[PDB]
Amino acid sequence: PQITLWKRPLVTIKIGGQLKEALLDTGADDTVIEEMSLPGRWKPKMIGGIGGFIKVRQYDQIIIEIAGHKAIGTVLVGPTPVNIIGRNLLTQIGATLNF
Amino acid sequence: SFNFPQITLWKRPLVTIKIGGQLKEALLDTGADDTVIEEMSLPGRWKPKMIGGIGGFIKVRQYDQIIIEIAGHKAIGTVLVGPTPVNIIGRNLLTQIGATLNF
Numbered sequence: 001p002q003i004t005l006w007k008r009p010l011v012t013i014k015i016g017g018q019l020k021e022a023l024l025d026t027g028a029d030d031t032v033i034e035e036m037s038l039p040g041r042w043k044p045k046m047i048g049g050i051g052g053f054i055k056v057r058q059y060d061q062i063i064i065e066i067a068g069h070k071a072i073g074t075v076l077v078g079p080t081p082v083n084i085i086g087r088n089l090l091t092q093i094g095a096t097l098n099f
Numbered sequence: 100s101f102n103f104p105q106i107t108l109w110k111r112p113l114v115t116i117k118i119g120g121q122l123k124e125a126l127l128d129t130g131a132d133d134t135v136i137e138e139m140s141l142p143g144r145w146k147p148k149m150i151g152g153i154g155g156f157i158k159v160r161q162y163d164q165i166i167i168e169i170a171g172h173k174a175i176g177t178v179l180v181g182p183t184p185v186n187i188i189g190r191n192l193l194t195q196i197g198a199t200l201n202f
């Protein structure tokens with residue numbers, strides 16, 4: 001529960017009944033997962049980053065387990081090359097940046 | 100929430116940096132391998148490189164051993180310069196300033 005940043009801060013998450021690897025990403029506003037199905041309603045969204053924008057599906061009130069911590073929040077699903085846990089869920093597991 | 104900007108990540112972890120004598124705002128970014136800054140002049144030689152983010156790849160200029168102050172902490176390391184929408188401090192420099200992620 002202290003993470004060095006000598007390497008990418010990857011953790012195991014559980015989402016939609018599936019285990020995935022994801023990056024703990026303080027530079028991301030949003031949580032973005034590679035294509036998968038999630039239950040309930042969704043709406044389209046455009047999100048941007050270094051290269052431009054991608055279109056994703058926004059699912060609200062999704063439960064996720066991050067390095068064994070349960071949280072709930074919005075999850076975006078779409079063609080990201082890496083699963084990223086952004087600040088909307090990092091706050092829910094109590095993550096902090098310290099220096 | 101808690102202070103800089105902030106620790107608990109309820110707001111973007113933005114800080115002031117100083118590079119080539121100029122102050123800029125930048126984001127502390129554990130998800131970024133590299134540090135990427137908007138167009139500016141830096142000394143010395145550079146080499147080109149393509150870096151990828153969420154949307155695709157951009158071309159940037161790699162400058163090595165650049166002096167940069169990050170929220171008052173001195174670092175000397177590699178800076179990539181190019182059309183990034185936000186100035187990014189990545190793990191190459193977060194480790195120099197002793198940043199850690201805790202949960």
Ligand SMILES: CC(C)(C)NC(=O)[C@@H]1C[C@@H]2CCCC[C@@H]2CN1C[C@@H](O)[C@H](Cc1ccccc1)NC(=O)[C@H](CC(N)=O)NC(=O)c1ccc2ccccc2n1
Binds near residue numbers: 027086130
């Ligand atoms: C900076 C660089 C070295 C290229 N690294 C990266 O970009 C890696 C690439 C990885 C593979 C692709 C999937 C994401 C990961 C993590 N990212 C870091 C990652 O932290 C990246 C850094 C960043 C921040 C702001 C603007 C641009 C880029 N964040 C993001 O990609 C998130 C995605 C999101 N919507 O949550 N972007 C934002 O949170 C965000 C915020 C403000 C913005 C203003 C204008 C335009 C775009 C903006 N995007």
Ligand SMILES: [Cl-]
Binds near residue numbers: 072073074088089
């Ligand atoms: Cl949320």
Ligand SMILES: [Cl-]
Binds near residue numbers: 175177191192
């Ligand atoms: Cl470096």
Ligand code: NA
Binds near residue numbers: 039040041059061062
């Ligand atoms: Na929902």
